[PDB]
Backbone as a ProteinNet text record, in pm:
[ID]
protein_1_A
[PRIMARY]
XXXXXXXXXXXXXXXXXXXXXXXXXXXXXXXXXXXX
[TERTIARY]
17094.3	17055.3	17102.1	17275	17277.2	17252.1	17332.2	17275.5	17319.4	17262.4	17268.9	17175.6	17227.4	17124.3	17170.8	17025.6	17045.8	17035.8	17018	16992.1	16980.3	16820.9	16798.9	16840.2	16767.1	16776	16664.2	16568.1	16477.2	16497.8	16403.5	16367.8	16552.2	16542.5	16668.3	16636.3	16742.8	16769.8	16819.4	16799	16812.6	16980.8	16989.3	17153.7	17263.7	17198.7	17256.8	17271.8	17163	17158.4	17201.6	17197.5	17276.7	17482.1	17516.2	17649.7	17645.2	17571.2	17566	17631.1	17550	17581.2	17727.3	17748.9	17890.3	17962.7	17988.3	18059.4	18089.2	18002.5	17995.6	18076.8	18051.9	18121.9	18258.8	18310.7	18417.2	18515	18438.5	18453.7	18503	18390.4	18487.9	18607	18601.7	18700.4	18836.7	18858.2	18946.6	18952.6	18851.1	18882.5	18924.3	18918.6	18982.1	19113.7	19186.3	19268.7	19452.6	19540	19628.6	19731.5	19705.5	19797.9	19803.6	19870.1	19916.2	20052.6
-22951.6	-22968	-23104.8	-23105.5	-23231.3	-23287.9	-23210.5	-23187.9	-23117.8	-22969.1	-22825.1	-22827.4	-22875.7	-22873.6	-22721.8	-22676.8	-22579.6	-22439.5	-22324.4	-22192	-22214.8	-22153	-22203.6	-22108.8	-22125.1	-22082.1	-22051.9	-21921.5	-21865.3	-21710	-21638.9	-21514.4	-21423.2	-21438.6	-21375.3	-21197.2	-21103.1	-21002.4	-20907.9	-20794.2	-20741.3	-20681.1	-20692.8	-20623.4	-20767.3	-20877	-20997.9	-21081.9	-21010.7	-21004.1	-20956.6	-20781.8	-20720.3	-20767.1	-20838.9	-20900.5	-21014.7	-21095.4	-21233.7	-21218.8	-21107.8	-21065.8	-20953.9	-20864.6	-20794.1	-20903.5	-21030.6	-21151.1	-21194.4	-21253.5	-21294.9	-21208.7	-21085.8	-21019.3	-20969	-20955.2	-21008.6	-21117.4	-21267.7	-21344.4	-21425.1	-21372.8	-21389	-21326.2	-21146.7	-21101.6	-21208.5	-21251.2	-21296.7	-21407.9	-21536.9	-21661.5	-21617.6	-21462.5	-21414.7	-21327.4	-21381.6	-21298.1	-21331	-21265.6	-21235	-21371.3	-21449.1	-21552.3	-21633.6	-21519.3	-21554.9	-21674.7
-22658.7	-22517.5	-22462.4	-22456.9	-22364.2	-22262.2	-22168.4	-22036.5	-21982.9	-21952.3	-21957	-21765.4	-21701.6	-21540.8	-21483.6	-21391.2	-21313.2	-21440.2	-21412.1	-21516.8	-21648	-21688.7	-21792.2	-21915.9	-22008.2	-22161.9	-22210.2	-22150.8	-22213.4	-22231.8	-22321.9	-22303.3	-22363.2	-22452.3	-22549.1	-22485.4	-22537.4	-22501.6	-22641.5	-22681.5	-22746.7	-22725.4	-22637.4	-22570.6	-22579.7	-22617.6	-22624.6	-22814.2	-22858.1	-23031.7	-23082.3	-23055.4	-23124.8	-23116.4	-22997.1	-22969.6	-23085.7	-23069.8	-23128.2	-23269	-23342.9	-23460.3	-23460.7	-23407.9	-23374.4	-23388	-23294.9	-23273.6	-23411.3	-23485.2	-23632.3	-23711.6	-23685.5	-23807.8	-23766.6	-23620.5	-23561.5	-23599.9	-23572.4	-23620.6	-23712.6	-23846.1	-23977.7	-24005.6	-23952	-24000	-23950	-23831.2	-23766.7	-23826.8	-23902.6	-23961.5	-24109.1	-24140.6	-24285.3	-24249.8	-24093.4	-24040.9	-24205.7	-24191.1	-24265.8	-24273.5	-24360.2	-24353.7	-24504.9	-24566.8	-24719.7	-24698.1
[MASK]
++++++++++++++++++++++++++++++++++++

């Protein structure tokens, strides 16, 4: 929280978690992307 002014950051979303995690496993695949 540096300085984040104006719309806050409460009240998470189930339609926004289930992404968070999709993202992650997205994610790795792509930081385990093909580069022998």
């Amino acid at each position: 929280a540096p300085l984040e002014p104006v719309y806050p950051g409460d009240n998470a979303t189930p339609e926004q978690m289930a992404r968070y995690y999709s993202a992650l496993r997205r994610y790795i695949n792509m930081l385990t992307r093909p580069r022998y």
